Structures are given as structure tokens and as C-alpha cells.
Amino acid sequence: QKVHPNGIRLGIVKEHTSVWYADRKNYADYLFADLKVREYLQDKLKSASVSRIDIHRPAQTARITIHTARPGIVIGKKGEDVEKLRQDLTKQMGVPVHINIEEIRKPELDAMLVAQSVAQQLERRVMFRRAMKRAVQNAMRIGAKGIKIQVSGRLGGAEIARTEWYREGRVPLHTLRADIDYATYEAHTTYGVIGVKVWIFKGEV
RNA sequence: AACAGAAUAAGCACCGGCUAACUUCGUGCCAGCAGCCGCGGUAAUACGAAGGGUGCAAGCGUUAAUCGGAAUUACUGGGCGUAAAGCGCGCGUAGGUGGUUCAGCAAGUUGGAUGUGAAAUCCCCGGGCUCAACCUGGGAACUGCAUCCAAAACUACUGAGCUAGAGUACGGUAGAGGGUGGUGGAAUUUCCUGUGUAGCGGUGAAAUGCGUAGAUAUAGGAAGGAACACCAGUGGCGAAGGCGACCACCUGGACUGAUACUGACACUGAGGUGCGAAAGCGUGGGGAGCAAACAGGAUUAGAUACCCUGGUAGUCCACGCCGUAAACGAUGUCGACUAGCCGUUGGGAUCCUUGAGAUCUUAGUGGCGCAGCUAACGCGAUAAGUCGACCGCCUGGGGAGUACGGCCGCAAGGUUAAAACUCAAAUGAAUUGACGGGGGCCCGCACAAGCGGUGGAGCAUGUGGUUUAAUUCGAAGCAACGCGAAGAACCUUACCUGGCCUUGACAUGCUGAGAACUUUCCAGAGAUGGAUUGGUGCCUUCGGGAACUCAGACACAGGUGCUGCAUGGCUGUCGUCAGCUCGUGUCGUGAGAUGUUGGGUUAAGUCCCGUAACGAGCGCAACCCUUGUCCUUAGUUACCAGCACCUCGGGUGGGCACUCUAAGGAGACUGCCGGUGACAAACCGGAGGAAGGUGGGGAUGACGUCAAGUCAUCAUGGCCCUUACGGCCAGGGCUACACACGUGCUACAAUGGUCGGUACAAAGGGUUGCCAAGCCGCGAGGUGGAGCUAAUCCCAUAAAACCGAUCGUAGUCCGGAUCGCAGUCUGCAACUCGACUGCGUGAAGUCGGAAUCGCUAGUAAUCGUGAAUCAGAAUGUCACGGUG
């Protein structure tokens, strides 16, 4: 059922989030670094929303480009968090670490940034649909050509597992030529676990 | 009037919907609640409490009892085609209603006057008690009944007329309208007679039956009984039931024309009177076929039934009875108005006349249709439309058209016709689905063609069952059982038996202690306990800090414990099936519907032509990968055509032709030819071409379904354990074992079996590894250490095929299970419990029931090779090639 919309297009649309060659004797000693970096960084940057954390390995050290749509929260008073983490990313990843920060201008057209706001609204006890009818039209005044948002879970009920489904525009999924974003962020309410899926469709080719 | 002092004085029901007003806590299909809907199975806004809140107040609630709401007994104010409801049809008494002109009358009717309709009560305007209830003055009202006066439209009564309703007299047609006799022809059966000789008859198929004691067939004859082909029709006639041979005989009514007469003589009809299909009943006839009851055969778990062979009352006639039917147009009779068109019976017209004529008009009988009505379906001059006159009948479902009583009947029975009790529903028309042993088109190894297996035997593997101290859980039709598990000697591992811990194996905070480290030691199955040379760091505001390790105490830690029906995540399934929806618009009272149907076509909701719909999305197609052709760029470790070289090995120099490798491109679009279609999609052929009509394969699975599976991968709501349901360590266990089922491998031999030679692959792994040459071993191997970080080195010898030999179809020079003995390898350790090797022994098995599965071409069938997991261990899983 609906094979993951990145794993079919690694190639014709998108590329990896981490590029580095490794021998067969060190391949599984760089993965375990790069997988507990991403669990570390998102638990620290719970605010100052983060979409993508890329990692390059040049000759013998590192490079990391953390993407936020609000860089001023992370770079606060000239890198009081930047040099503080750069001391302490080396303690998990023994090479010296670079940290680079870009902007995510138009923050309402990347799926991770959108779906983090859905968990925020649905844990403030906002209505399950008034939160989302406004979170699609706002992401259609500027930008995209199609948006699907599925909201599944407890949805407040007693024994209820309904799925909200609202769509606008055009979203293909069996065209490999197209360009689709995808993100699943969850939510822990005072009862039940709500999972949210987002399918922002940018332009094709 | 004075004194005292805020002192002397607030409950009751309810809070899920109707219905104003809400959340926590107990409880868990228990107790309990309730005016109806109905709540309660472990999170209850409905039960019990607690806060809060709403209604009313000196009262608030329940029960009982009437009228409202109830247009639910409908006078004002309902109904009867299908929801309950039109008698089976006539005739007719009492009664109800009355066409049209005058004239009279005044019984109804209207207007007025008088007498009355007790007072109170109700209503209106006032007046008294500090207000109000309460008391009270004046008026209206009491709808009525009676007596007088007047008016005269309508009804009644009376008197006279009129002909439009109704009836009579006269021509004239059409008819299965009745009753009483008579007479036919075809066919069936029984009987007689001739010829002739082996079956007839029956049915999914048979059997009972009938036959040489001469059947069926076939010809001749006789007797008898009932029905009346073709004409024959939405056709006729009758009050309805009903009525079909031809003729005579009596006999009723309808149509149509002309003309005179009577002058309202009419309509309906409670009671009462008649005619009442068929089955049945009584007495007498009559007995061809058909046929309940019955008998036998068959089918059948069973078959009184369907089907088969027989067969009686009855059906037929006369006379008498019974009175019901889906007695149907599910529609009482009678009268008047309201657009059309196409039929048909019979009858007059007019009309040019030859008509296969024309138009108009009545009496019937059919098909469509506008207004209109209808819940809808549907009726629509033969109303269910608009209106009149009289009658019958209906009041939720069962109980029940039933019981008692009455009247009729020879009998069966019929007609008239209740109640108690019990339920919150019974029923109507129309929608979307689902389903059919209903119909129409289409597709799939779905059948049919073909090859090969499963179930027979042996071993391998899983589940059920059994058993044990534990055989740790989970997955139960296809969708399950070589399944999580891509590896159980211990470890894994959860379970069992013990040994052993309590802030803990681990997290953070607190208090002390020492750097960490190294201790090379004993006890003990180990866990652990105690020795134990040593070590004394590290940054120093030199104060210490941080680092680690030990103890104390608190919050806690931890959980493979329950819930997959509290859920997220991730996968199966229908199904790679061709569908699934929306916007705006119009139709419908509404749930809906249309687009998305029709014709053609397609692997396809793919296209074309059509069309109250016009569009859009998801899907299909393409975009991606791989294989097949060629071109360009590229030449080491790959490559050898040309060149020498050679020791004859691309060995070497060399070459960039090639094969190969991998980058980037072209090629295929029904493009072109012909035919075919509406010439429009497309379809059938044809050329060229490496490839021809989506070239072959792969990934890609729509809206959804099954509360499908998983809390034991992980994440989480709740619930329990927290001196153990948590931790630690030994051995055991999951591999036990009369049995049954699932997949899988070998075999059962001569398209074979051995021995000796000899030929050709792809794909992949390897510096914590591959482990060569030499070397020693019957053999698995042991030495030995190269080469190697990979087109180089190693894994690494492909097997079937071919060639020669023997083997002669024998449970075997077949088959290899079992088992004895002897070895090597990994690992601390091969007892329960590993894999291989040697030697010996040699089983079942001679192609395998009912059944049942896979496959349409490099495919089935058969032969090998590699990888993942991995110290060791594949008949499985995944993957690549031979022969075909």
C-alpha cells in the first residue's frame, strides 16, 4: 500500500541527505554516528523548526548544514548555541564538526515544517478540522499546486479511528517525473497517539 | 402609639434527547434506573455520591381521575385503485332528493312587538376591606319557547300549463342471450375378423406393466360415450356468474332512422324478494376419456411428494339442495361540463365518383396524451379531473371473521358477531446496494486441449495431539502449517530446578569515600566472598575542581505482565482488477438521479460518433530500470586482426582493428502499402527492418473492505507487579513421541548403472580475511606459507553432453534408511544435541486409491554454481547459468 514517495524517486527527482564514500571496514562505523546525530539534534531543536540535516564527509573530518526557517533563534547573539554545540557534537562524533545554517524562506512549502505545526495545534485542544482547513489554504495562497493532508488516530472519540482526508489541487503519485515532499510527525495528546501525513506537491519535472 | 434588637423565621425536585441547566469519583451485563426512546460487559455528562447549575417557593414532588394536544367518531373539520375500508349482482316497499312557465297561499324563512327564560355564577362599568382574594350596586347575556304584525326571493302545499327528462306506437339491422327436441364428421377406447412375427410402452436413465395362450403395427366391421378443430379477433351478447357444431321450435333485451302521441309519469333504496362459477349433498339414470382417495415401480439420509404404470368417487343427464371465491376494473348506481391523435365492432349521414373513397355524428370496445389530481406508482370523455342526489362501509397489530347466543341447512357449514390478554409496532408506494439453480454481452491455465507431480514407501521440516519439572509465547478456510527464525551444544532464552541479590544491571538529583588502574591468590558448580606486589594521575584562584570507583538514604529504576475491539506505525487481502468521486447546472415534495448512459472499439471509464449536462481530480497510458541493433568518447589488470619476437605461453615488444567494459546517443511512431469501418476511431493482411503493432521482463497496486494480523521490532492511553511478575549464575529444556495433516527431497532402474579418458558457463565473495605451489594422509585433511586489498591473487575442479569398456532388466553391480566400528574440524566444552570421512551391514520400495495442484516458450522438465545469516551447521530462502 503506497510505497514511500522518496524511496521510489532517489534519482530522477531527489537525492540523498548524506553523501560520503566508505570502505567495507568502516561503512557501519559512520552510520551509527550519523543516526544518533539526527536523534540528538531534533531533541535539542524542538523549537526553531528544522526540516533537513545534511551531512557531507570531506577529507577526514565533517560538514553539517542544519536548515531552519528561523536562524536567529539558533544563532543567538553571534553563535552562543553554534560554538556550544560544536564543542559537543565532537563528543558523539570524534571528528571536528562544521555547522552551517541556511534559511527556509517560504516555510509553508516544506512538509516537515508544516506537520510540526499540526502537532502543536492538536495538542492545544484545537478542533481537528479548523486547524487544518486553515493550514492548507495558507499553504495555497503562496506556492504549491496540490496538497493532501491525512489526519488519523484517536481524534478525540471513545473507540474511534477515523481518518480526515482533505485535499486541494492536483497530486500525482504514480509519476516518477514529479517532485513530491513527504513527512510524518506524530502527536501525543492526553489520550491516544495521532499521526499526521503530508504530501506537498511542488512543480513537476 | 411606645419599647427590645438583625435578633424570631428555607427548603424541594431535576440536570442523555423531547426540556431550562455538568463535570469529576465509586460501580463494572453486578447492583440498580425509567413518561417514552432505552442506558450498565472496566475511562458511565442516564445507576450511587461530590462540587456546580437551572426551575419553582411556604411549599415542592409522585400516584389516581376528567377535558385538551387527538382533523384519533371529523356538524363546524377526515376517508374507501394498491396502506384498514365499495355488499357477488339485480328488482323494489318505508324513507331521502325534484326539469320548466304563471297564479294563489304563508306551513318553513327573515324583520319587529309582547309574555317568559328564579336569584346566584360567568362577562362589562363602577363602589367598599391599607392592596388583593372577598363583598357589593347598574347593565348585557341566558342562544330558548309561545302569542301577534308585516314582507314573498327560495323550499313546501294548492290551481293551471310547457316539452328539453322518461315511456309508447313505426320501419330497420347485429348477436356463443335463454329453453325444448333433432342430426352430423374427425379422433379415443372396448369387441369381432384377416394378414403378419418379436418385442411394445415408458423415462435424466431405468423399473412396475403388456407380449408367440400371437402384442404393437395393419385392414374390415359393430357398439357406445362426452366434447365441438380451422373460422376466432384488445370480436360479440348478457344485470352479474356465464355463453362457441348445424336446423327447426318457442322467447327476452339492445341499437338506428323517420314521425305522431302521453306531459315530469324521474332518481336511489334500510329492511324484504330473486338469479347464485366450481367442489360438495339427496333419489334415479348413464360409464368413452380424464382422474383426488388408493396400489406398485423409481428417486431419495428419509419422500406421505414431484416423475412412471394402473385406478374409484366424481366430471355427463333429469329433479331438489347448498350459497360462498383473487365472485377483480382489488374502482356502488345515476346525471352534467372539460385539449388532442391512432385503432376497431354496427348504424345512419353528407360527398366529386372510380374508390384500396372522404369528412362528420351517435352506441360500444382498445393504445398514447395536456390541464388537472395523487404519498408515489399511475388514471386522464370507459377519470382516480371539476360538481350534484341517495346508499354501503373503515378506526393500530395479534387475539379473530374466531368463541358463545340467534336464524337458516339433511349434512358439510354459512350468516350476525365480542371480550380478557399481549406487543410498540403492523402495512403502502418508491430509492441506493447486495443477492438469483432470471435474462443479455465480455474476460481469465476457468474448462477443453498437452506435459508433469501430490495422496504409496523412505528420510527432511512445520503444525495438531500426547506427555513432562518446563516442552516459553504469537500466526487458524482460500489470506496457516520450510510460518516470525537470514542458523536453539551453552550463549541466544523469554520457560523449568536451584544457588543469590534489594535505590538495584542501568537514569537523574543527595551524603561520604578514594585517581583511574594493576593485582597475576585461595575458597566455592559458578554467582560471589576475601586476600592482592603494585598505581597515585589529571586542570590547578593551589583553595580545590572535574574525572572515574565504593557505601548510605529518598524520589525512583525496571517489566518479553493484560488490552491489535483504546490507538499510531508497518504489511497481507480482494486485484494490477478497471474502476471510484467532486464542482457548477437542470429534473424530483424527498432519499436519489444525471454526467459515468447509446452505437462502434479497446489489454483499459482506452478512444470515436452521439447526447441536459459542461468540466476537473484519482486511476489506466507514458515518465524509471533491464535485455536485444547501431553510432560516438575511452584502452589497463581487459583485447590479439596486422607486425616482429619467442622458450611457442599475448610469453614479449607492440597495436587501438576487435571482443569486452560503461558513459552518452539514435531506432518503432500503425510510420508506410493494400483492403476493410460512418472512411472514425480502429481492424485484417503487406513491404522494409536487429526488433511490428503496449518487442520480452521488473518496480509502480485507486476510493475501500475484512474492528484481518502484530502491545513480542519499535512508539503510546490505561491497568496491575515494585523484598519481585524485577535482577544474577550454574545444569535442564524448546531437538520428548502409539498417532493424524501440510509442504519438500531422493528413489523404485537398461532414454539406465559403473570404470577409464575428455568439452564448453554465468554470477558472486575475500587485509580481523582468501588461505595457493610443494608436502604428508584409504579419505575427510595436516603441514607449508605465497600472492592479495583486487577485471591482477585466491575462492574455483561447473555438471548434464560426448568416447571406450563392462552391466542383461535380477529386489538387481537397483536403492540407499537403519546400525556396529574407526577417524578428522570448529569450539572452554560434540552425553542428552553438530557436520563430514573410512570400513561393514543392508531394509521399505517393482510408478503409487478416491481425489488434486502447477505451467502457454528460453516456458515446463532435468543438471550444476554462488551469496546472505554464520566459530561450527541447508533437502529451505534468495540469486546465475547449461540442455531444452
Ligand SMILES: [Mg+2]
Ligand atoms: Mg435572622
Ligand SMILES: [Mg+2]
Ligand atoms: Mg446521576
Ligand SMILES: [Mg+2]
Ligand atoms: Mg376532537
Ligand SMILES: [Mg+2]
Ligand atoms: Mg331500486
Ligand SMILES: [Mg+2]
Ligand atoms: Mg338569572
Ligand SMILES: [Mg+2]
Ligand atoms: Mg370473474
Ligand SMILES: [Mg+2]
Ligand atoms: Mg371486494
Ligand SMILES: [Mg+2]
Ligand atoms: Mg461507475
Ligand SMILES: [Mg+2]
Ligand atoms: Mg556458515
